Design an enzyme around this catalytic site. Structure first.
Site, PDB file in Angstrom:
ATOM      1  N   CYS A  68       0.802  -1.217   0.000  1.00  0.00           N
ATOM      2  CA  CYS A  68       0.000   0.000   0.000  1.00  0.00           C
ATOM      3  C   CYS A  68       0.841   1.276   0.000  1.00  0.00           C
ATOM      4  O   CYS A  68       0.314   2.379   0.172  1.00  0.00           O
ATOM      5  CB  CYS A  68      -0.953  -0.006   1.192  1.00  0.00           C
ATOM      6  SG  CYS A  68      -0.122  -0.045   2.797  1.00  0.00           S
ATOM      7  N   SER A  85       7.565  -1.902   4.756  1.00  0.00           N
ATOM      8  CA  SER A  85       8.386  -0.751   5.099  1.00  0.00           C
ATOM      9  C   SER A  85       7.963  -0.169   6.441  1.00  0.00           C
ATOM     10  O   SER A  85       6.773   0.011   6.712  1.00  0.00           O
ATOM     11  CB  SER A  85       8.290   0.318   4.015  1.00  0.00           C
ATOM     12  OG  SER A  85       8.794   1.555   4.477  1.00  0.00           O
ATOM     13  N   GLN A 124       6.948   3.597   5.562  1.00  0.00           N
ATOM     14  CA  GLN A 124       5.638   3.673   4.928  1.00  0.00           C
ATOM     15  C   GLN A 124       4.546   3.425   5.954  1.00  0.00           C
ATOM     16  O   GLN A 124       3.519   4.108   5.971  1.00  0.00           O
ATOM     17  CB  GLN A 124       5.523   2.656   3.792  1.00  0.00           C
ATOM     18  CG  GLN A 124       6.419   2.939   2.594  1.00  0.00           C
ATOM     19  CD  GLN A 124       6.091   2.060   1.387  1.00  0.00           C
ATOM     20  OE1 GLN A 124       5.448   1.014   1.515  1.00  0.00           O
ATOM     21  NE2 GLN A 124       6.528   2.488   0.208  1.00  0.00           N
ATOM     22  N   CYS A 135      15.411   4.712 -16.139  1.00  0.00           N
ATOM     23  CA  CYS A 135      14.181   3.935 -16.250  1.00  0.00           C
ATOM     24  C   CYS A 135      13.171   4.543 -17.212  1.00  0.00           C
ATOM     25  O   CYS A 135      12.423   3.824 -17.876  1.00  0.00           O
ATOM     26  CB  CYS A 135      13.531   3.768 -14.884  1.00  0.00           C
ATOM     27  SG  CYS A 135      14.287   2.513 -13.881  1.00  0.00           S
TER      28      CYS A 135
END
Ligand SMILES: CCCCCCCCNCCCCCCCC
Ligand SMILES: CCCCCCCCNCCCCCCCC
EC number: 2.1.1.79
Lengths: 291, 291
Positions: free
Chosen positions: A70, A93, A96, A273
């Site tokens: 999430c 995490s 997080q 990226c």
């Protein structure tokens, strides 16, 4: 059974909430945006992406939504606000988790708001709908038990935790299948090989990108059907450039915060990226999975 | 000017002469063999490879041969024995240097036998012919100055250290050019990407594989012409399997010597690389360069 890739994940996402704060949008959404209209800022595009996904779940109020990986909560916090569902968020995490937990204190609702430091491997409650944005590339990873064979446990698990009208929106970076890579004319110069190595070394250790056919094989093996393949990877270029630009803009704050090397590493990461998706070397796909 | 990739090279080739002794052939030739006849052992195939290369140099006795990345001496020691030339060998490995130095004491000849811990970047004497087997993949590397732009210095340098009938046999692993990769139907699954990363991480840090067109561009820019492209990469499969098998055969000696992990790492390395050449993902080419 399976062990969640805790340390691999923590090495990236636990780098510093303030650090990510610098260059993520304000919702701190850490996944491919959706420029549904050419003029959206990044932040509006993240909303558009969250919306786009949640809409596919046919959510009704009171339902329970599980968000796997999430991130920094934007999806959960949006799912309650705009749909009035109870939410459970899974993350590995600490940062997080800390942040989503506090972000939850703020706004209020009769709906349940749960963030957990729990792996999908360890989850075992019944839910109505499932969302996962930009976490899937870590599911083939494990604390010494990596392997795409893991997708099998995954899809069978959450097929069994959901009702008969259960739905799953799987949002993930992907890579081209044999036939399609050839057809694209894809090629892997040495520079590219050096880059991936750099990515798997400095950024996302143990990360594994699926081929659509892999998602098919394991999902259908569990009984899932894909109601839609929404390929939207082109949006990651605007997203990634935005992130790169913002980080550069805060170069001095960022060097002050987590150091010189890290500005370099992440600029290199982000710029690099972008091209991957520009070149159609990688893609992003949103699978609507149903029964 | 340029700084030689000393530490990168040393981390691999200085692993232990006894360790390599276990699984290399007896000549300790560390490069693609040449199974000129289907029944050669590995060791006879290494001779065949050395021969094959040296023959292209049109060597005469008394001439001076420079061997760049002279490995464990087999090429030098063979060049004196079979051609009666004086030899200078360049290496950055302490172990390789130690060993070639001693290996030279043994057999005798009125010919000069020199091994140096010197980079091609630093070499500056005149020579007649030049050989380099399986070292070239390190030339685009440097002590913080890597880049294919380095090939330019290289070819211009040794064009100037050689007479007008000067010749260079450049033997190197390569990777397919755009057009040719597509034509081969090459594809880069996730497993492969993980592997290269593993290679550039655990085995050959900073290594860079050339495309034939790169060798063309920089060589001709210096005034060289390629009299022959001898593609011989298919031979690396027998070679690499041989090495892998021998290492496995000595598994217990090897684990005793440099440890458990290293048996695993190198078995994984050797087995894995074999497939790269089996699949034509990589190749080996011998450029005969002339003026
Ligand atoms: C080798 C692949 C590593 C696994 C992917 C982890 C990305 C998890 N999403 C959040 C971060 C997205 C950043 C963009 C990644 C592009 C490549
Ligand atoms: C990514 C490439 C690294 C640079 C190549 C260094 C090989 C130098 N030759 C001696 C060892 C050959 C081993 C076979 C290499 C196959 C791949």
């Amino acid at each position: 059974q399976l062990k969640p890739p805790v340390e691999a994940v923590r090495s990236h996402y636990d780098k510093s909430n303030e650090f990510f704060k610098l260059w993520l949008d304000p919702s701190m959404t850490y996944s491919c945006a959706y420029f549904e209209r050419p003029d959206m800022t990044l932040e509006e595009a993240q909303y558009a992406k969250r919306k786009l996904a949640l809409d596919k779940l046919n959510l009704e109020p009171g339902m329970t939504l599980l968000d796997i990986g999430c991130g920094w909560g934007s999806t959960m916090r949006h799912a309650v606000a705009e749909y009035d569902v109870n939410v459970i968020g899974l993350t590995l995490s600490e940062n997080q988790y800390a942040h989503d937990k506090a972000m939850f204190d703020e706004v209020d609702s009769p709906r349940r708001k749960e963030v957990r430091i729990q792996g999908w491997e360890e989850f075992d409650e019944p839910v109505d709908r499932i969302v996962s944005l930009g976490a899937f590339e870590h599911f083939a990873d494990g604390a010494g038990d990596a392997g795409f064979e893991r997708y099998d446990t995954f899809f069978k698990k959450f097929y069994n935790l959901t009702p008969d009208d259960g739905r799953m929106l799987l949002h993930t970076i992907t890579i081209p299948d044999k036939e399609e890579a050839q057809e694209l004319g894809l090629t892997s110069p040495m520079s590219l090989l050096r880059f991936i190595k750099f990515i798997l070394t400095e950024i996302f250790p143990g990360g594994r990108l699926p081929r659509i056919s892999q998602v098919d094989y394991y999902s259908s093996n569990a009984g899932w059907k894909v109601e839609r393949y929404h390929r939207i990877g082109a949006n990651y270029v605007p997203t990634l450039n935005a992130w790169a630009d913002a980080l550069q803009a805060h170069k001095d704050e960022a060097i002050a915060l987590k150091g010189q090397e890290t500005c370099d590493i992440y600029m290199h990461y982000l710029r690099g990226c972008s091209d991957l998706f520009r070149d159609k070397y990688t893609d992003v796909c949103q699978f609507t999975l149903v029964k």
